Amino acid sequence: VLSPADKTNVKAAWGKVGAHAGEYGAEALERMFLSFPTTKTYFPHFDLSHGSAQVKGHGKKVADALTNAVAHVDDMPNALSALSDLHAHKLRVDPVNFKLLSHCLLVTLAAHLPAEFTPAVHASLDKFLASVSTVLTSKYR
Amino acid sequence: VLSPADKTNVKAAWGKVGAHAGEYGAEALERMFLSFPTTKTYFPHFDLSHGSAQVKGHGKKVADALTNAVAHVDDMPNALSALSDLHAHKLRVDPVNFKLLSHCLLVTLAAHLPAEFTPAVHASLDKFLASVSTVLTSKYR
Amino acid sequence: VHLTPEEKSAVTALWGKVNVDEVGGEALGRLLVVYPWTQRFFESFGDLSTPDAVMGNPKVKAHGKKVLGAFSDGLAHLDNLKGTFATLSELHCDKLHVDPENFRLLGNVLVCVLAHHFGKEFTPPVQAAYQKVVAGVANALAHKYH
Amino acid sequence: VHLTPEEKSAVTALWGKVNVDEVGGEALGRLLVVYPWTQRFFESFGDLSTPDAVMGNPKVKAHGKKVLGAFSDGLAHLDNLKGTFATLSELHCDKLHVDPENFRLLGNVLVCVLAHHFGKEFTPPVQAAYQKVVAGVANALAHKYH
Ligand code: HEM
Ligand code: HEM
Ligand code: HEM
Ligand code: HEM
């Protein structure tokens, strides 16, 4: 459960991400594919080489969805409804992988927000990514 | 999210458990300590030898809590409120261990309910134990 | 892996009583029912829409038998699961694109099936031995991923 | 574990720039803040009630330094982490009763700290190398549990 303070922390941090959201999304993906190669089993149809348009494009989609979630943090289940349907009935990514991407997103943020990524913000962001992950896996069964 | 069918399946199965609930609780614990020895790190103050009164006693408490959860399956957060406080602020068991106990409970049920443990009931029970686990870890942060 | 001789003989003894075809079909079917996202690899298989459809699906049964047969053969080489499963590991990564988390899920469902099948004979020590084996097999199958 | 020489030199190079005392205090403090149930082992340590209290707590800093120092020494024996950490593994199991999942949590927090510290120098390939190392260390520390 996100406390008001958590929501303030997430809005502040993501605010500073602003326009780089797509670039950070792609970086997080690349970090995930290199650190946790098992995640590549879900992207056999992509060119996963560095700088690939497919990864950049996907990174931007992931980032926009997170932007949408931050904007509607009080109403995430509704805001992400179409995305939970998509992952539950179509993509069917095993839930363990959400953790892996969440960690890589956190690392990406840490590497780009030296001043913003305080212990308290780190905690709030991890909580937020866990909530997004929970919503996206809500309808799996 | 437990569907009405899931709730019917859980009430039916747990109904058949009835009076053996405590005995099954102890068996599940013993299965957990043997199969996943890392879980014993939370019980250094117990005699974990087979048949120990401490384990039997604890098994009965676990089982009664699950009985309480089945009775209030529409209102679990409230029903288990004291238990979530206890695990979050006192016991502080790492969330991964809930999975391990859930699996051993499932195995125990399978071994004792040959006729009841159909594929559909298995699915409902796994879902139910995951929901209980989610409630018990709700207030960790 | 590393089993004590009493664990090894426990695993061996119980397995001599297993109908591999039947247990295979059951374990794969229950995997697809309890964790429906695993159905992702099998849409070539027909009707998987209800529990009864999955459990009665002949392709599911056939594949279950193929999987458990390979598993069986690995019980004969508990000292070197990685060598035994290296080719299959490669295949599941490079050609089939199966997330190795699926191997862990199947291992746990298999333990539930053995428990259901054997009842009180599937004691806590026997379960412990089988947990080591299924973790070992999952490991071995994931070893050549990249 | 198994690092390619380019992974090994990546790990080594970055680590030569780490202030072990400072990074240690930070990693342990953030572990206690982001995953507060880990505070369970440290109530002898004083005030852990707010993020600022945790990060400024001298016992947390001292312990963080002790932990990362042992970690440091393990970087010198990447070829045999299990042998290097066998005694500590035993100690954490038999005497300290630390669930080895804590080692994994700390490994991930340490990676976040390195990223925060080094910024763009902590590239995806370097992170990948460090992930293998922290998983290896967690493994090594969990190896003698029973
Ligand atoms: C923070 C959690 C995540 C978010 C917000 C997210 C969001 C999205 C979005 C917005 C799409 C595009 C949907 C569309 O085309 O309309 C998508 C597609 C997809 N996602 Fe997720 N995702 C997440 C986690 C994951 C993880 C962990 C995996 C696998 C490791 C994954 C695998 C995929 C795949 C395979 C696609 C399809 C890509 C394609 O064919 O172009 N997702 N995701
Ligand atoms: C289905 C999930 C579980 C349920 C329903 C449950 C329920 C309970 C209950 C009813 C108590 C007794 C509280 C009291 O004294 O008032 C308890 C205590 C405790 N639980 Fe949990 N528990 C669960 C999972 C776990 C897991 C996974 C672990 C660790 C592997 C764990 C470790 C403990 C410990 C250490 C105690 C204290 C025992 C003592 O000192 O006597 N619990 N639990
Ligand atoms: C006990 C673990 C497993 C073993 C021993 C195993 C073994 C095998 C074997 C022997 C084959 C046939 C290979 C060939 O044709 O040359 C196979 C194929 C396959 N397996 Fe695995 N498997 C295991 C687990 C899984 C899991 C859990 C899944 C996914 C849920 C999976 C998905 C597949 C698929 C999709 C094929 C291809 C079937 C086909 O072509 O129609 N396997 N496996
Ligand atoms: C990188 C992983 C880790 C390493 C290398 C490590 C290493 C050490 C060392 C060198 C000591 C001192 C042993 C002695 O006095 O003889 C120690 C003690 C201890 N560690 Fe670990 N540790 C690690 C992770 C953890 C984690 C994650 C926790 C729990 C959150 C933990 C909890 C403890 C505790 C409670 C003590 C006892 C401190 C005392 O007596 O006051 N350690 N560890």
- H-helix or E-strand containing C106? helix C101-118
Q: Cα B108 vs. chain centroid, distance in angstroms?
A: 10
Amino acid residing at A48: L
End-to-end CA distance of chain D: 22
Exposure string (b/e) for A9-37, b if CB count within 10 Å is 16 or more?
Answer: bbeebbeebeeebbbbbbbbbbbbbbbbe
Q: How many residues does chain B have?
A: 141
DSSP result, B105-136: HHHHHHHH-TTT--HHHHHHHHHHHHHHHHHH
CATH number at residue B137: 1.10.490.10
Q: C88 lies in which domain range?
A: 1-146
> Residues B51, B99, A106, CA angle at the centre, nearest 5°?
145
- B87-121 in b/e burial notation, b at 16+ Cβ within 10 A? bbeeebbbebbbebbbbbbbbbbbbbbeebbbbbb
The alpha carbons of chain C give a radius of gyration, in whole angstroms, of 15
Give C120 to chain B, closest Cα distance, Å.
Answer: 6
* CA nearest neighbour of A59 among A102, A21, A13: A21
Two tokens at C67?
């999987």
Could you tell me how many residues make up chain D? 146
Question: Which atom of ligand 1 approaches the CA of A129 most closely?
Answer: 1
The amino acid occupying position B47 is D
Count of domains forming chain B: 1
- Select from A27, A34, A106 the Cβ nearest to the Cβ of D112: A106
Max distance between CA atoms of chain A, in angstroms, equals: 41
Instruction: Give the span between the Cα atoms of C74 and D142, in whole angstroms.
Output: 26
Residue from C34, C82, C96, C133 to probe ligand 3 pocket by mutation (most atoms less than 8 Å from CB) = C96
Distance in angstroms between the alpha carbons of the first and the last residue of chain A: 22
Structure tokens at B37: 């020895």
Question: With contact defined as beta carbons under 8 Å apart, do D39 and D48 qualify?
Answer: yes
Whether A69 and D73 have beta carbons less than 8 Å apart is answered as no
Q: Which amino acid is at A126?
A: D
Show the tokens assigned to D85: 């950490």
Q: How many CB atoms lie within 10 A of CB A45?
A: 7
Identify the helix (H) or strand (E) that includes residue A76: helix A76-79
Given the structure tokens 């053969």, which residue do they identify? C73
Residues 6+ apart with CB under 8 A from C96: C41
- Please identify which residue in the block is written with the tokens 């071995």: C140
Structural domain boundaries enclosing B20 = 1-141
Instruction: Kindly report the backbone phi and psi dihedral angles of residue D123, in degrees, each rounded to the nearest multiple of 5, phi listed first.
Output: -75, 160
For chain D, what is the radius of gyration of the CA atoms? 15
CA C37, distance to chain mean position in Å, is 17
Q: Quote the CA–CA distance of B33 and B28 in Å, as a whole number.
A: 9
Which conformational region is residue A10 in: left (phi greater than 0), alpha (psi within -120 to 50 degrees), or beta? alpha
| CB-CB neighbours of C52 under 10 Å | 14
Contact D89, D143 (CB under 8 A): yes
Contact A41 C146 (CB under 8 A): no
State how far the Cα of C74 lies from the Cα of C76, in Å rounded to an integer. Answer: 5
**Spatial separation of the C-alpha atoms in residues B111 and C119, rounded to whole Å:** 4
- Structure tokens given for A108: 């990406």
Exposure of B29 by Cβ count < 10 A (0-12 exposed, 13-18 middle, 19+ buried)? buried
Q: Test D119 with A34 for CB contact under 8 angstroms.
A: no
Q: Which residues contact D121 (CB under 8 A, 6 or more apart)?
A: D14
Helix/strand/coil for C13: helix
The CB density around residue A83, as the number of other CB atoms within 10 Å, is: 18
Residue B105: name the closest of B77, B70, B53 by CA: B70
Sequence-distant contacts of A126-132: CB under 8 A, at least 24 apart: A126/A102, A126/D34, A127/A2, A127/A6, A127/B141, A128/A2, A128/A6, A128/A10, A128/A69, A128/A70, A128/A73, A129/A102, A129/A105, A130/A102, A131/A2, A131/A76, A132/A66, A132/A69, A132/A76, A132/A80, A132/A102
Please answer whether residues A114 and C119 qualify as being in contact, where contact means their C-beta atoms are separated by less than 8 angstroms.
Answer: no
Residue B54 token pair: 């401490």
Contact D99 B97 (CB under 8 A): yes
Residues 6+ apart with CB under 8 A from B110: B117, B122, C112, C113, C115, C116
Handedness of CA A106, A107, A113, A115 (dihedral sign): positive
Residue D141: count other Cβ atoms within 10 Å of its Cβ.
30
Q: CA nearest D32 in B: which residue?
A: B141
Ligand 1: does its nearest atom lie under 6 Å from the Cβ of A132? Answer: yes
C43: closest CA among C67, C19, C60? C60
Coil/strand/helix, residue C146: coil
Report the C-alpha gap between D98 and D62 in whole angstroms. 19
CA B5 vs. chain centroid, Å, equals 20
CB contact under 8 A, A94 and C142: no
CB–CB contact A110 D118 (8 Å) = no
Rg of chain A taking only CA atoms, in angstroms: 14
**Which residue minimizes the CA distance to atom 38 of ligand 4?**
D63
Ligand sitting nearest the alpha carbon of B63 = 2
Q: Tokens at residue C54, please?
A: 């999955």
- Vertex C129, ends C124 and C134: CA angle to 5°? 120
C42 class by beta-carbon count within 10 Å (0-12 exposed, 13-18 middle, 19+ buried): middle
Chain A neighbours, 3+ Cβ pairs < 8 A: B, C, D
**Experimental approach taken:** X-ray
Please choose, from the candidates D84, D90, D66, D95, the residue with its C-alpha nearest in 3D space to the C-alpha of residue D136: D84
- As for how many domains chain C has, the answer is 1
- Residues of B within 8 A of D105 (CB-CB) are 94
Q: How far is A132 from chain C (nearest CA, A)?
A: 19
A141 contacts in chain B (CB < 8 Å): 123, 127
Query: C107 phi and psi, to 5 degrees?
Result: -60, -40
Contact between A125 and A21 under an 8 Å Cβ cutoff? The reply is no
Resolution of the experimental structure, in angstroms: 1.7
Q: In angstroms, rounded to a whole number, what is the distance separating the alpha carbons of residues D41 and B20?
A: 36
Only one residue has tokens 């010198």, namely: D76
- Phi and psi (nearest 5°) for B73? -65, -20
